[PDB]
Ligand binder design. Structure first.
Ligand code: GDP
Ligand code: GDP
Lengths: 154, 154
């Protein structure tokens, strides 16, 4: 089985849940984490489709060394969320690789966006590798299937 | 209006129609083309969402010079379809750019695939930029939204 041990680390209070509209495949109360992993589909590829982790003194710098995709997420709206890049360098520090990523911005149903989409998009244009999403279903597969896309290219 | 004058050129008898499950937004008899264009949504971006063209002595090498995305398609199954690369160089010859592309393979509902997905995937791994799809709805937005993705990066 062609598999893919990815992960996402993330900013303080936004969403386990994008993939919750997906492994288990619904929208769920319950705060997450510990490192709640689980394995589980076919663009024609044979994969085992995510290891969730909290919204880290040691431990973050432990369980992360066995990842091939930390395309973090934040709410595309929250004012310490892309701002929390702040989670990019340390993945580039753990697996000393200047790495399998994408800018996912959560939540554009609830109105307020300080983070104008096209604002974190210039952040994408230095990086080269963005997204907007919500479990309560579109676009979430999209992006982690997009994940599936650059790591074959890796 | 941030727009995107893309296009797709293509192999001999496969599908106008991926986007037909989309502009007009359904699955349609009717052979295509002439250069049947039409303009027409929001990952949070403001675009004008495709110029169809036939399944070319001059003319192909005419209307193509005003394109920013020819992520051709073929059926991921048909034995003169990725084989028809054969449509890659001439886009790299028109806009002398060694360019905004992706390997889209159509049709994996009807069984037979000679083109094993993971076969044209090594074709993707030289290229760096694949897909599998069907109008009769999933994945087609996916990929041309994926189109929307690399050309901001361009
Ligand atoms: N409005 C909105 N709520 C969402 C969306 N996706 C998930 N949720 C909510 O996200 C919340 C909190 O985040 P959590 O799951 O604890 O993530 P973490 O702290 O970053 O690990 C829960 O209240 C969910 O009900 C979304 O797209 N939109
Ligand atoms: N089985 C199948 N038929 C499709 C799919 N998408 C489109 N069609 C069919 O594609 C056919 C022929 O292609 P056409 O639209 O003429 O494309 P072009 O010659 O390459 O410009 C029509 O018979 C459609 O009904 C698909 O995903 N699966």
């Amino acid at each position: 089985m062609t598999e893919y041990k990815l992960v996402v680390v993330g900013a303080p209070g936004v969403g386990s849940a994008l993939t919750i509209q997906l492994i288990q495949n619904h929208f769920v109360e319950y705060d997450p984490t510990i490192e709640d992993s689980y394995r589980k589909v076919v663009d024609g590829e044979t994969c085992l489709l995510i290891l969730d982790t909290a919204g880290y003194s040691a431990m973050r710098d432990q369980y992360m060394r066995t990842g091939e995709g930390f395309l973090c997420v934040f709410a595309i709206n929250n004012t310490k969320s892309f701002e929390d890049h702040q989670y990019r360098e340390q993945i580039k520090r753990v697996k000393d690789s200047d790495v399998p990523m994408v800018l996912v911005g959560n939540k554009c149903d609830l109105a307020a966006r300080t983070v104008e989409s096209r604002q974190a998009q210039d952040l994408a244009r230095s990086y080269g590798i963005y997204i907007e999403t919500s479990a309560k279903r579109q676009g979430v597969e999209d992006a982690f299937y997009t994940l599936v896309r650059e790591i074959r290219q890796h």
